[PDB]
Design a protein around this ligand. Structure first.
Ligand SMILES: O[C@@H]1[C@@H](O)[C@H](O[C@@H]2CO[C@@H](O)[C@H](O)[C@H]2O)OC[C@H]1O
Ligand SMILES: O[C@@H]1[C@@H](O)[C@H](O[C@@H]2CO[C@@H](O)[C@H](O)[C@H]2O)OC[C@H]1O
Length: 389
């Protein structure tokens, strides 16, 4: 039968966390109850540890972000903010690829834009929200409906201005993790020095485009965050569809194991295709996220483990360095049960608990696994995610 090895001595990326977006200008804010469902880690709560928000172009809208951002922080989360457009007096229009009236930040206003981002940072700080990071731009390379930045404009801002931002600087938030938006920053010593978090979105991003050798070479001291996605679609009322929801778990496994990502952040938290339904309950897509978010907590470290021990079975493992305990998340996308011997050499652990989601149950506690020495034999139900803790 199939075997996997978890190697607790081969440490990979430190986990920062998991979460999603609030946008109270475009859609309704989270309600009081929804804030707790998202950021609490009790029964029937998602255990999210990252909130993302927008930086409005009109400072008279900033007050609308405060209640949800404050609640998330109270429940243990960190908050990152991204702008879509500068204030209109800083914007000029230009023609891009033949399309007129497109927006870019006026070059002669780069310093004024820093002051706008800093004014947001200071406004949120005055209201009890200490931002973990602020982005230069949401999707500078997909800005048909907002503000475009070329790779060079992004680079010049990163090199010449981003040092003046009073927060961690996240860039470039390419819509698809396109390396042409980030390579210039990683290759310029001043820009790289001004960077703190390499942020990327995953819209259309394949497994082969998840590794990033340049970042493994140049990225020492920088974090690596996947700051927006929905998968496998944004279809109306799709969030409970099965086995489609297993794609959410698989995308997260891939982000962690193939991309070495430290954070994975959904789009709108509350939406008919999101982790929280419009009625405030958790969706099947939400339970997929929860198999990671509720158990792989911030500061756990991913470790090397057999990622794909048999066809349609995917394994990731994270270690809590406080006690060398292990959290393993195993996805079985097969329509048949799979029996695996999981070897964890040199562990003192002899018993694992397990929680299982299928099409018919959500995070169901099942019977404990007893090890024979350092080997744990596990049977995975068909079309399931199991978290072993
Ligand atoms: O003018 C604003 C639009 O730009 C906005 O459209 C959003 C663009 O980002 C997409 O990810 C959203 O799905 C889409 O709704 O909507 C509000 C409007 O004021
Ligand atoms: O809301 C937008 C998405 O609709 C957009 O979707 C991607 C566009 O490029 C395609 O190659 C991808 O398959 C698709 O996921 O991503 C950006 C986002 O703002």
């Amino acid at each position: 039968m199939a075997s996997a090895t978890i190697n607790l001595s081969a440490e990979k990326q430190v986990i920062r966390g998991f979460g999603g977006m609030n946008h109270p200008v475009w859609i309704s804010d989270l309600t009081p109850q929804q804030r707790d469902t998202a950021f609490g880690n009790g029964e029937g709560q998602l255990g999210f540890t990252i909130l993302r928000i927008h930086v409005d172009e009109n400072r008279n809208n900033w007050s609308k972000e405060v209640a949800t951002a404050r609640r998330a922080i109270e429940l243990g989360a960190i908050v990152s903010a991204s702008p879509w457009n500068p204030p209109s007096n800083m914007v000029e229009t230009f023609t891009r690829n033949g399309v007129p009236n497109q927006k870019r930040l006026r070059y002669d206003k780069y310093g004024d834009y820093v002051q706008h981002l800093n004014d947001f940072v200071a406004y949120m700080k005055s209201n009890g929200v200490d931002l973990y990071a602020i982005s230069v731009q949401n999707e500078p390379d997909y800005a048909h409906e907002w503000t475009w930045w070329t790779p060079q404009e992004m680079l010049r801002f990163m090199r010449d201005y981003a040092g003046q931002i009073n927060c961690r600087v996240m860039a470039p938030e390419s819509f698809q993790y396109l390396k042409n938006m980030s390579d210039p920053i990683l290759n310029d010593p001043q820009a790289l020095a001004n960077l703190d978090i390499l942020g990327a979105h995953f819209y259309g991003t394949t497994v082969n485009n998840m590794p990033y050798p340049l970042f493994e070479q140049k990225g020492a001291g920088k974090e690596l965050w996947m700051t927006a996605v929905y998968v496998p679609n944004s279809d109306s009322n799709s969030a409970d569809r099965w086995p489609e929801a297993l794609e959410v778990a698989h995308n997260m496994h891939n982000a962690l194991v193939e991309g070495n990502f430290q954070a994975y952040v959904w789009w709108y938290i509350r939406r008919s295709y999101g982790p929280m339904k419009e009625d405030g309950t958790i969706s099947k897509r939400g339970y997929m996220m929860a198999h990671y978010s509720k158990f792989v907590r911030p500061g756990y470290v991913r470790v090397d483990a057999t990622k794909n021990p048999t066809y349609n079975v995917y394994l990731s493992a994270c270690k809590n360095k406080k006690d060398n305990s292990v959290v393993a998340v195993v996805i079985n996308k097969s329509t048949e049960a799979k029996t695996i011997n999981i070897s964890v050499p040199g562990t003192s652990i002899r018993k694992w608990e397990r929680y299982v989601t299928t099409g018919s149950k959500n995070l169901r506690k099942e019977s404990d696994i007893n090890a024979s020495g350092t080997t744990f034999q596990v049977t995975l139900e068909p079309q399931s995610v199991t978290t072993f803790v």
